[PDB]
Structure formats: C-alpha cells, structure tokens
Amino acid sequence: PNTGVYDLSGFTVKPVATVYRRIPNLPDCDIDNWLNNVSVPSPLNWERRI
C-alpha cells in the first residue's frame, strides 16, 4: 500500500449487566405467605383461598 493516513474502525461489544426495570402491574399474590401459615387445618375442615 501507499504512504497515507488511513481511518481504521475499531469495535467494542457489551452483552452483560442488563437492568430491566418493569413497573409491574399488581402486587404478587404471595401464595407462599399462605402455604407457610401456622394453623394447618385437618382433612375434615380444609381451607381454600382464591
């Protein structure tokens, strides 16, 4: 090649450290705050939550 000044492109990539804020809809149901309840009912009078 000839005597000159050549513009040579360099690169950088970044795949890591995403953030993903979301502003979600409703508050979580918290099933596990009910399944870890203390007063467990017996098979005659089982409970149910919807």
Binding site: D7, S9, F11, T12, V13
Partner: protein, 50 residues
Amino acid sequence: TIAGHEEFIQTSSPKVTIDCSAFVCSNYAACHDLLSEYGTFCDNINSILN
C-alpha cells in the same frame, strides 16, 4: 477626511468526516453482514469526503 470600513471573506469550512458503517449499522453484526453486500457504497462516500 479618511473613512474606514471592514469586510469579511470566507476562505474555509469545517472538515467533516463520517464513519459510514458506524452511522448505518452501529454495533450489530447482522446489520454489518447485510451491509457487506452493498459493497462499494461506503467507500464512495469516504472517497468523496476525502
């Protein structure tokens, strides 16, 4: 008497360089693979600006 007045003549302009592949297909490799078949399109732009 003697009168003075001034005038301005422009002799130059700002020198602008453009990295054509960074402008079109910034960091994304699929875009670079697609742009590689227009071929001699960014080189004509670079040579005109030089």
